Amino acid sequence: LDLAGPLLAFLFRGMFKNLLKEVRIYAQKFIDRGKDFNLELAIKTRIIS
Amino acid sequence: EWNIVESEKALVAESHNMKNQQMDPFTRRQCK
Amino acid sequence: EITPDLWQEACWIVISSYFDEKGLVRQQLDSFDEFIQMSVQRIVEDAPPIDLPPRYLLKFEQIYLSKPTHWGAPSPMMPNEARLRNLTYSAPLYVDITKTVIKEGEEQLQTQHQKT
Known part of the structure; x- marks a missing residue:
């Protein structure tokens, strides 16, 4: 039986892969310019929340 | 508290009234 | 000493202790507590570090959690x-x-950020 524990641990894995994809793309768009990239604006708070 | 006292006095009454239990309408399984 | 024929009263003391110790929704509360306490720290500490021209490390670790706050002032x-x-x-x-x-030229740095 999957209770509120595994049911939410199933969501959190995908919702934590999505924001790592987002930080990936945000670092990609910033290192190719030759400048430096900031993770504070790369971590999209609206994926988990 | 009165209920926990009532239960135990009723239990002692049950233990005391162990002379003969003959009433019919109640049964239990006796397989094998 | 054994408890013969007194078991009706004794059969329910243990049930009452069970339902005092554990409520009726304990399987929900325990599951959610175990989620928060272990599964969140497990999902985040085993996601591989990301890299990408020189490239970086960007490793996560040691999650925190706070109490429900609204904000105004928090x-x-x-x-x-x-x-x-x-x-x-x-x-x-x-x-x-x-x-x-x-990076090339043998230059490196190790900046970090707590409680992101």
Whole structure:
């Protein structure tokens, strides 16, 4: 039986892969310019929340 | 508290009234 | 000493102790507590570090969690207040991060950020 524990641990894995994809793309768009990239604006708070 | 006292006095009454239990309408399984 | 024929009264003392120790919704509370306490720290500590021209490390570790706060000035939202204002009774989530990187010419740095 999957209770509120595994049911939410199933969501959190995908919702934590999505924001790592987002930080990936945000670092990609910033290192190719030759400048430096900031993770504070790369971590999209609206994926988990 | 009165209920926990009532239960135990009723239990002692049950233990005391162990002379003969003959009433019919109640049964239990006796397989094998 | 054994308990013969007194077992009706004794059969329910243990049941009452069971339902005092454990409520009726214990399987929900325990599951959610185990989620928060182990599964969140497990999902985040086994996601591989990301890299990408030189490239970086950007490793996550050691998650934190706080109590439900609303903001205005930060204050704790009581569940009744969240129920009346159509809010969401939730708590923010923070973690530590290290943006280590190394580049050509043998130059590197190891900056870090707590409680992101």
